[PDB]
Ligand binder design. Sequence first.
Ligand SMILES: *[C@@H]1O[C@H](CO)[C@@H](O[C@@H]2O[C@H](CO)[C@@H](O[C@@H]3O[C@H](CO[C@H]4O[C@H](CO[C@H]5O[C@H](CO)[C@@H](O)[C@H](O)[C@@H]5O)[C@@H](O)[C@H](O[C@H]5O[C@H](CO)[C@@H](O)[C@H](O)[C@@H]5O[C@H]5O[C@H](CO)[C@@H](O)[C@H](O)[C@@H]5O)[C@@H]4O)[C@@H](O)[C@H](O[C@H]4O[C@H](CO)[C@@H](O)[C@H](O)[C@@H]4O)[C@@H]3O)[C@H](O)[C@H]2NC(C)=O)[C@H](O)[C@H]1NC(C)=O
Ligand SMILES: *[C@@H]1O[C@H](CO)[C@@H](O[C@@H]2O[C@H](CO)[C@@H](O[C@@H]3O[C@H](CO[C@H]4O[C@H](CO)[C@@H](O)[C@H](O)[C@@H]4O)[C@@H](O)[C@H](O[C@H]4O[C@H](CO)[C@@H](O)[C@H](O)[C@@H]4O[C@H]4O[C@H](CO)[C@@H](O)[C@H](O)[C@@H]4O[C@H]4O[C@H](CO)[C@@H](O)[C@H](O)[C@@H]4O)[C@@H]3O)[C@H](O)[C@H]2NC(C)=O)[C@H](O)[C@H]1NC(C)=O
Ligand SMILES: *[C@@H]1O[C@H](CO)[C@@H](O[C@@H]2O[C@H](CO)[C@@H](O[C@@H]3O[C@H](CO[C@H]4O[C@H](CO)[C@@H](O)[C@H](O)[C@@H]4O)[C@@H](O)[C@H](O)[C@@H]3O)[C@H](O)[C@H]2NC(C)=O)[C@H](O)[C@H]1NC(C)=O
Ligand SMILES: *[C@@H]1O[C@H](CO)[C@@H](O[C@@H]2O[C@H](CO)[C@@H](O[C@@H]3O[C@H](CO)[C@@H](O)[C@H](O)[C@@H]3O)[C@H](O)[C@H]2NC(C)=O)[C@H](O)[C@H]1NC(C)=O
Ligand SMILES: *[C@@H]1O[C@H](CO[C@@H]2O[C@@H](C)[C@@H](O)[C@@H](O)[C@@H]2O)[C@@H](O[C@@H]2O[C@H](CO)[C@@H](O)[C@H](O)[C@H]2NC(C)=O)[C@H](O)[C@H]1NC(C)=O
Ligand SMILES: *[C@@H]1O[C@H](CO[C@@H]2O[C@@H](C)[C@@H](O)[C@@H](O)[C@@H]2O)[C@@H](O[C@@H]2O[C@H](CO)[C@@H](O)[C@H](O)[C@H]2NC(C)=O)[C@H](O)[C@H]1NC(C)=O
Ligand SMILES: *[C@@H]1O[C@H](CO[C@@H]2O[C@@H](C)[C@@H](O)[C@@H](O)[C@@H]2O)[C@@H](O[C@@H]2O[C@H](CO)[C@@H](O)[C@H](O)[C@H]2NC(C)=O)[C@H](O)[C@H]1NC(C)=O
Ligand SMILES: *[C@@H]1O[C@H](CO)[C@@H](O[C@@H]2O[C@H](CO)[C@@H](O)[C@H](O)[C@H]2NC(C)=O)[C@H](O)[C@H]1NC(C)=O
Ligand SMILES: *[C@@H]1O[C@H](CO)[C@@H](O)[C@H](O)[C@H]1NC(C)=O
Ligand SMILES: *[C@@H]1O[C@H](CO)[C@@H](O)[C@H](O)[C@H]1NC(C)=O
Ligand SMILES: *[C@@H]1O[C@H](CO)[C@@H](O)[C@H](O)[C@H]1NC(C)=O
Ligand SMILES: *[C@@H]1O[C@H](CO)[C@@H](O)[C@H](O)[C@H]1NC(C)=O
Ligand SMILES: *[C@@H]1O[C@H](CO)[C@@H](O)[C@H](O)[C@H]1NC(C)=O
Ligand SMILES: *[C@@H]1O[C@H](CO)[C@@H](O)[C@H](O)[C@H]1NC(C)=O
Ligand SMILES: *[C@@H]1O[C@H](CO)[C@@H](O)[C@H](O)[C@H]1NC(C)=O
Ligand SMILES: *[C@@H]1O[C@H](CO)[C@@H](O)[C@H](O)[C@H]1NC(C)=O
Ligand SMILES: *[C@@H]1O[C@H](CO)[C@@H](O)[C@H](O)[C@H]1NC(C)=O
Ligand SMILES: *[C@@H]1O[C@H](CO)[C@@H](O)[C@H](O)[C@H]1NC(C)=O
Ligand SMILES: *[C@@H]1O[C@H](CO)[C@@H](O)[C@H](O)[C@H]1NC(C)=O
Ligand SMILES: *[C@@H]1O[C@H](CO)[C@@H](O)[C@H](O)[C@H]1NC(C)=O
Ligand SMILES: *[C@@H]1O[C@H](CO)[C@@H](O)[C@H](O)[C@H]1NC(C)=O
Ligand SMILES: *[C@@H]1O[C@H](CO)[C@@H](O)[C@H](O)[C@H]1NC(C)=O
Ligand SMILES: *[C@@H]1O[C@H](CO)[C@@H](O)[C@H](O)[C@H]1NC(C)=O
Ligand SMILES: *[C@@H]1O[C@H](CO)[C@@H](O)[C@H](O)[C@H]1NC(C)=O
Lengths: 493, 52, 142, 142, 142
Amino acid sequence: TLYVTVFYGVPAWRNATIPLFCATKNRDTWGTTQCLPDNGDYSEMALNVTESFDAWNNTVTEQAIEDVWQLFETSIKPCVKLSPLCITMRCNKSETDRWGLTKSITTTASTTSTTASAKVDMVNETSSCIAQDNCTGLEQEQMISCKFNMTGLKRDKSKEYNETWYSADLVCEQGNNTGNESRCYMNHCNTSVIQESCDKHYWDAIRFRYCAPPGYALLRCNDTNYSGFMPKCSKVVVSSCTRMMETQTSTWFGFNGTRAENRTYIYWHGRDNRTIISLNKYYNLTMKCRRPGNKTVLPVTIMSGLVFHSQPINDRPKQAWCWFGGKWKDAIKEVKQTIVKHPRYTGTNNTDKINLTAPGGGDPEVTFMWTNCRGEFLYCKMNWFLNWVEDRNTANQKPKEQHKRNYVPCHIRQIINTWHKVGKNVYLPPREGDLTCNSTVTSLIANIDWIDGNQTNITMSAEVAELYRLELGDYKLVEITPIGLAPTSCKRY
Amino acid sequence: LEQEQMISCKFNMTGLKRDKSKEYNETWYSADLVCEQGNNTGNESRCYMNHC
Amino acid sequence: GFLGFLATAGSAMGAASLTLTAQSRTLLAGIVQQQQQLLDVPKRQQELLRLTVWGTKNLQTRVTAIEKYLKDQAQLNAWGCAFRQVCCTTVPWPNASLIPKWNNETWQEWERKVDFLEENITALLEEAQIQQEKNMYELQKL
Amino acid sequence: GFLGFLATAGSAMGAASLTLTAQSRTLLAGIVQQQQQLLDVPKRQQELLRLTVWGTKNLQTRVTAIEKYLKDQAQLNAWGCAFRQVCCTTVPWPNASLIPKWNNETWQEWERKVDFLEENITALLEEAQIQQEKNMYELQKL
Amino acid sequence: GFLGFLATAGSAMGAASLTLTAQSRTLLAGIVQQQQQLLDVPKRQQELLRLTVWGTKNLQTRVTAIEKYLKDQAQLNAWGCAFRQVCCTTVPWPNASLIPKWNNETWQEWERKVDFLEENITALLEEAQIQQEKNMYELQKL
Ligand SMILES: *[C@@H]1O[C@H](CO)[C@@H](O[C@@H]2O[C@H](CO)[C@@H](O[C@@H]3O[C@H](CO[C@H]4O[C@H](CO[C@H]5O[C@H](CO)[C@@H](O)[C@H](O)[C@@H]5O)[C@@H](O)[C@H](O[C@H]5O[C@H](CO)[C@@H](O)[C@H](O)[C@@H]5O[C@H]5O[C@H](CO)[C@@H](O)[C@H](O)[C@@H]5O)[C@@H]4O)[C@@H](O)[C@H](O[C@H]4O[C@H](CO)[C@@H](O)[C@H](O)[C@@H]4O)[C@@H]3O)[C@H](O)[C@H]2NC(C)=O)[C@H](O)[C@H]1NC(C)=O
Ligand SMILES: *[C@@H]1O[C@H](CO)[C@@H](O[C@@H]2O[C@H](CO)[C@@H](O[C@@H]3O[C@H](CO[C@H]4O[C@H](CO)[C@@H](O)[C@H](O)[C@@H]4O)[C@@H](O)[C@H](O[C@H]4O[C@H](CO)[C@@H](O)[C@H](O)[C@@H]4O[C@H]4O[C@H](CO)[C@@H](O)[C@H](O)[C@@H]4O[C@H]4O[C@H](CO)[C@@H](O)[C@H](O)[C@@H]4O)[C@@H]3O)[C@H](O)[C@H]2NC(C)=O)[C@H](O)[C@H]1NC(C)=O
Ligand SMILES: *[C@@H]1O[C@H](CO)[C@@H](O[C@@H]2O[C@H](CO)[C@@H](O[C@@H]3O[C@H](CO[C@H]4O[C@H](CO)[C@@H](O)[C@H](O)[C@@H]4O)[C@@H](O)[C@H](O)[C@@H]3O)[C@H](O)[C@H]2NC(C)=O)[C@H](O)[C@H]1NC(C)=O
Ligand SMILES: *[C@@H]1O[C@H](CO)[C@@H](O[C@@H]2O[C@H](CO)[C@@H](O[C@@H]3O[C@H](CO)[C@@H](O)[C@H](O)[C@@H]3O)[C@H](O)[C@H]2NC(C)=O)[C@H](O)[C@H]1NC(C)=O
Ligand SMILES: *[C@@H]1O[C@H](CO[C@@H]2O[C@@H](C)[C@@H](O)[C@@H](O)[C@@H]2O)[C@@H](O[C@@H]2O[C@H](CO)[C@@H](O)[C@H](O)[C@H]2NC(C)=O)[C@H](O)[C@H]1NC(C)=O
Ligand SMILES: *[C@@H]1O[C@H](CO[C@@H]2O[C@@H](C)[C@@H](O)[C@@H](O)[C@@H]2O)[C@@H](O[C@@H]2O[C@H](CO)[C@@H](O)[C@H](O)[C@H]2NC(C)=O)[C@H](O)[C@H]1NC(C)=O
Ligand SMILES: *[C@@H]1O[C@H](CO[C@@H]2O[C@@H](C)[C@@H](O)[C@@H](O)[C@@H]2O)[C@@H](O[C@@H]2O[C@H](CO)[C@@H](O)[C@H](O)[C@H]2NC(C)=O)[C@H](O)[C@H]1NC(C)=O
Ligand SMILES: *[C@@H]1O[C@H](CO)[C@@H](O[C@@H]2O[C@H](CO)[C@@H](O)[C@H](O)[C@H]2NC(C)=O)[C@H](O)[C@H]1NC(C)=O
Ligand SMILES: *[C@@H]1O[C@H](CO)[C@@H](O)[C@H](O)[C@H]1NC(C)=O
Ligand SMILES: *[C@@H]1O[C@H](CO)[C@@H](O)[C@H](O)[C@H]1NC(C)=O
Ligand SMILES: *[C@@H]1O[C@H](CO)[C@@H](O)[C@H](O)[C@H]1NC(C)=O
Ligand SMILES: *[C@@H]1O[C@H](CO)[C@@H](O)[C@H](O)[C@H]1NC(C)=O
Ligand SMILES: *[C@@H]1O[C@H](CO)[C@@H](O)[C@H](O)[C@H]1NC(C)=O
Ligand SMILES: *[C@@H]1O[C@H](CO)[C@@H](O)[C@H](O)[C@H]1NC(C)=O
Ligand SMILES: *[C@@H]1O[C@H](CO)[C@@H](O)[C@H](O)[C@H]1NC(C)=O
Ligand SMILES: *[C@@H]1O[C@H](CO)[C@@H](O)[C@H](O)[C@H]1NC(C)=O
Ligand SMILES: *[C@@H]1O[C@H](CO)[C@@H](O)[C@H](O)[C@H]1NC(C)=O
Ligand SMILES: *[C@@H]1O[C@H](CO)[C@@H](O)[C@H](O)[C@H]1NC(C)=O
Ligand SMILES: *[C@@H]1O[C@H](CO)[C@@H](O)[C@H](O)[C@H]1NC(C)=O
Ligand SMILES: *[C@@H]1O[C@H](CO)[C@@H](O)[C@H](O)[C@H]1NC(C)=O
Ligand SMILES: *[C@@H]1O[C@H](CO)[C@@H](O)[C@H](O)[C@H]1NC(C)=O
Ligand SMILES: *[C@@H]1O[C@H](CO)[C@@H](O)[C@H](O)[C@H]1NC(C)=O
Ligand SMILES: *[C@@H]1O[C@H](CO)[C@@H](O)[C@H](O)[C@H]1NC(C)=O
Ligand SMILES: *[C@@H]1O[C@H](CO)[C@@H](O)[C@H](O)[C@H]1NC(C)=O
């Protein structure tokens, strides 16, 4: 009686695992070469369907992470290799001893001072201490002047050059230098070859959106209860392309997020306690970073004919530093409250027993905060900041860490181990002139870890990749498979 | 059955530090070397790889 | 694009507007956007068109757009439908235990309950067409 | 092909001269010559087949010919009239202000005057085909 | 790997098969297996996808197969027998001197005896279709 019949144009789908197209507005380099132009269509329609969503186990977020990484690699790939520079350099001894790269026992320093010296120092836009880069506690940058012998395309002739390195970028040979001119090499050369990131990478913003190929569609949760993992999402919105994503990579805090809303959200990985806490834009949280001093950049042509950008500064500038503005104290109170009320949390409901904290260990990739300020990476020690925002009773943190300030000291590092799971080292060319960056702060990257109903530790994390799961995350990609079967009485002829 | 015929040769090779180098112990199969001939009345004959 | 396939979702099995023509137009949209971008890339990069990962990803989606289109037309032809709105068959439904509620269940819910049969049905539909071709051949000989 | 298809251009719209076979023969002639070259190249160059600019270009021209064929056949199937000349669709002409002079205007001139109608018409023609076919389903059930 | 055509190769011209759906089945099996591997390669190797020659050989192979599929469909559309088995064209057989033994010869044996007729026949079949087409145009116009 009932025949299978096959219906075509059927409104049904299944999970897809395919590549998405990138589309952009910035077509100066990578956009023209790799991406579709942004179609400009940001409309969406809702369906009366229920669907399962999961930010961590997603193909949409997985591609965002991998694609940002690959566009970085294809940009640096053809740049000059700096293995010709892995030679002994002749560095000023006072500087290598002073900042700890080399050792000396002839300094015989002895200091007596007051220990009851903690201060509270606030800064804002209307202040001369910012304009002059001189706030209480800010020391010098720690740049070391080194000379070296380099050969260009003439081969049988060579010249001596002036390079001033950040102390973070050198190793320096130690022991029995009873004169001057210490012997130094780059921090990560010998186990590998350092490549220069010459094609203006990170000097501007990279923003793009993803588009489904024909026959595929993106579904999105449009709830307020989406916490990263949601088995039954009742508000499912359909679109052909995602929202525009900011491919920014910083640890501890994320900056310039697209998911900026007048609400605090916390995505929790369903199987773990790693979370991405958005911040409430209501408080206009912002970070203003400054790199004082006027740099000179000197191109050097080396053997292969490719150019390296040297840094002959010959000066002693103040440290790079970052200034935090906006209502930070209140934004943090909301984060703690949001955690307390969150469905996956069964810890303390006392907000005075919930604290922000740095990860431990001596590893700079987790103990600092890395901000890319227009091409230069700026690691910042944040104890002054944390003590302030928490209104912490410092008391026993040792004399230079006991202060409450809304700014932190930071140092520039030119040889940066990259963020993806590669371990690769690249060199970041210097920027000419000075640098200033004014970014919004949109998210906090942290784990929530408690073992009792007192002390919850929101532990700052350095997994930069987690940020992409806040930018997207709520998207699912599906395949439209519009062939259906259904028993009916209508046998052919 | 006889011995394999392996020849022990030393050479100076440079790694990534460029201005630093080390001497290495390399034992070649005899068929992999050319070896310069004539008036070696001492030791340390002078050899190159067979196909370079 | 248009996504009329999703626009009618949730309307139940006794569905309206099964937009058959939607597949032809989704193919056209695919071809136009990819072709325009490939013509655009050479303005700055003429060599590394497929020789850099972005172009292997974009070629794969272009070739695939052609192949997906053809898989559906070929499957439909394999089942006897030059054009398929419903294109009725001669193959009976596997059992009475799996009957849709035309006025309650949706196509998404329904299809996910019969994936099992789709694997066995595809073969049966093809077998029915093979016998029909044999019957036509005998009529041609007669 | 010989491109004799356009030989009639300048004859006026109503001067017959329409054909459904010209594109098949143009494509078929093309496929044979292009396949012969794909198989000829390896007699001298086996590694660099698409590793060069000319390799990529030959890919692009073979694919373009195929995509074009499919775009047109797919659109006709959506309207259903793959083999029907005039096709006889049931969609009314949009307005009386746009009427051809069958014995004055040519098809080149005419089509460039109705490019904006195609934008609304394609969808109407597709729906008409869907409505006709769903009615046939109801009739087969009855 | 259906092998439906080869299966009746040893019988006789006036005996068996004349199968159309087997080409669709063959194409579907091919496309699905290639897609499964293309989705699989990026699981381990994303950079070397078209960059090196193995990927250009697999690409040429796939493109050739697609062109072949469409080549036969295009020729049939010109003749009209997309789905007509024997088609029934009106072009006279070139001469009475070359006649099949329907009960002794196979199609393989037969086709190799008419290779020098096909060169003229394809063109003649197309010309016949063109005149019939013109006649149908005028009848539809009337
Ligand atoms: C399209 O995409 C979407 C989005 O990704 C897909 O949705 C996701 O699909 C997944 C695959 O099916 C689901 O995961 C699976 O869930 C199973 C059920 O988990 C619950 O029950 C567990 C045990 O309970 C048994 O007994 C009860 C009796 O009432 C039965 O009802 C159950 O069915 C079981 O028989 C229980 O342990 C689970 O709890 C743990 O996991 C959840 C995960 O969400 C956590 O939230 C919990 O906190 C808890 O985590 C702890 O324990 C796990 C180990 O189990 C650790 O890894 C964690 O770190 C932590 O310590 C739930 O209550 C699981 O049984 C199943 O696991 C089996 O199979 C996998 C292989 O797939 C093996 O590797 C495992 O070892 C095990 O054998 C798996 O986790 C997702 O939940 C679902 N996501 C959403 C949002 O809905 C969709 O399927 C896709 N569709 C298509 C067509 O592709
Ligand atoms: C978070 O988000 C915020 C935004 O909300 C980010 O902050 C913004 O970031 C922008 C992108 O970096 C930055 O814009 C740049 O400012 C530079 C300073 O210009 C100032 O004056 C102009 C007016 O003339 C103002 O419009 C501008 O706002 C500033 O006040 C400009 O120099 C930059 O312009 C450059 O790019 C355009 C691109 O079209 C070029 O046409 C132009 O010639 C400039 O080109 C230089 O930089 C490009 C980078 O692509 C190079 O390719 C190019 O060769 C030039 O570089 C050379 O010249 C410099 C010296 O000029 C030299 O050092 C170098 O070595 C080269 O020789 C551009 O307009 C916003 O100002 C900034 N806004 C604020 C308020 O902070 C923030 O970064 C994000 N934060 C994080 C964490 O990422
Ligand atoms: C955007 O986000 C803003 C927050 O970042 C939203 O502002 C909040 O809006 C709520 C709802 O109106 C206010 O809650 C009320 O507060 C008053 C005042 O209580 C004060 O004193 C008690 C002690 O007695 C103390 O516990 C409170 O914290 C306050 O200090 C209460 O009387 C009400 O019952 C209620 O709790 C928030 O106070 C207010 N926050 C801030 C920082 O202003 C804003 O509404 C959002 N915008 C939009 C458009 O939605
Ligand atoms: C995130 O950290 C919290 C705190 O450690 C984890 O909570 C813990 O959850 C597990 C179950 O997932 C609890 O273990 C079970 O407890 C019950 C009740 O005592 C017991 O009957 C079971 O035999 C088992 O021991 C554990 O006690 C609980 N700890 C606390 C202090 O709440 C949470 O699961 C972590 N999230 C993930 C996914 O790791
Ligand atoms: C690459 O160099 C590092 C460091 O260089 C050496 O140690 C410095 C302190 C200085 O004295 C340089 O002149 C030396 O060349 C090597 O790491 C050291 O390895 C030793 C032995 O395991 C260990 O005792 C030291 O603590 C390590 N020091 C540091 C700073 O890590 C590293 O092994 C070299 N890699 C290669 C391939 O040569
Ligand atoms: C927090 O919740 C407690 C009740 O739950 C207890 O504390 C949790 C942190 C957790 O460890 C649970 O397992 C415990 O059972 C509230 O305590 C009650 O407060 C009322 C007054 O409002 C008092 O009359 C009850 O007797 C208290 N109950 C108990 C068991 O002591 C506490 O007030 C909540 N605090 C906040 C800030 O919300
Ligand atoms: C590469 O080297 C071979 C051999 O090296 C030379 O001869 C050896 C016996 C020894 O004395 C080495 O130090 C020498 O450098 C060259 O082959 C010889 O060519 C000459 C001239 O045609 C011929 O008379 C010899 O018999 C050849 N000897 C052997 C062992 O083949 C070869 O020509 C060199 N190739 C190049 C490009 O220089
Ligand atoms: C980021 O914000 C700072 C203010 O904190 C801006 O610096 C001021 O710029 C104006 C215009 O050139 C000067 O008149 C002020 O004197 C500057 N202030 C200070 C403290 O120096 C800065 O221009 C903003 N953005 C960027 C990219 O530089
Ligand atoms: C998503 O939710 C907002 C309210 O937060 C609503 O205004 C909007 O229309 C919803 N989008 C869709 C497609 O329904
Ligand atoms: C460096 O080069 C200069 C010539 O430009 C030469 O006089 C000097 O001796 C060289 N120094 C070293 C250590 O090679
Ligand atoms: C320094 O000299 C002393 C002898 O006075 C010797 O024992 C020591 O090993 C030397 N150290 C280095 C690094 O050369
Ligand atoms: C410092 O360098 C100079 C050469 O520029 C050298 O003459 C002097 O002796 C060095 N100082 C010491 C303590 O050796
Ligand atoms: C080679 O090995 C011998 C031991 O047989 C050792 O004495 C010599 O120093 C080694 N030479 C090199 C270059 O490693
Ligand atoms: C070996 O020495 C003799 C002189 O005794 C000389 O004629 C001959 O050229 C030399 N051969 C070599 C290879 O040096
Ligand atoms: C062997 O080499 C040594 C140097 O290591 C040298 O002194 C000695 O004389 C050489 N043997 C002969 C036979 O020349
Ligand atoms: C979807 O929900 C709206 C109300 O928001 C209702 O009017 C509409 O009929 C529903 N559609 C379906 C297919 O359930
Ligand atoms: C028969 O019905 C049961 C449901 O009760 C289903 O699981 C099974 O697959 C069906 N068998 C066939 C051949 O359709
Ligand atoms: C749909 O469900 C209702 C009960 O809510 C039932 O009366 C009706 O018969 C069902 N429709 C079909 C087609 O089974
Ligand atoms: C498909 O057919 C096989 C026998 O060839 C049988 O075992 C299997 O259960 C059938 N599948 C379904 C869904 O009925
Ligand atoms: C084109 O002009 C020629 C005369 O040069 C004429 O014979 C031919 O019919 C014209 N073609 C058309 C389509 O009018
Ligand atoms: C009506 O005719 C005018 C004539 O120029 C044309 O511009 C307009 O688009 C037509 N209206 C339609 C198709 O609705
Ligand atoms: C082919 O050979 C087999 C024996 O191996 C025989 O049974 C079959 O009938 C033969 N088929 C034809 C067409 O001759
Ligand atoms: C006539 O028959 C002969 C023998 O089969 C053949 O070679 C020749 O091509 C045929 N001529 C035509 C016009 O078909
Ligand atoms: C096949 O050959 C036989 C002789 O063995 C003959 O009698 C018969 O007519 C031939 N069949 C055809 C179709 O010519």
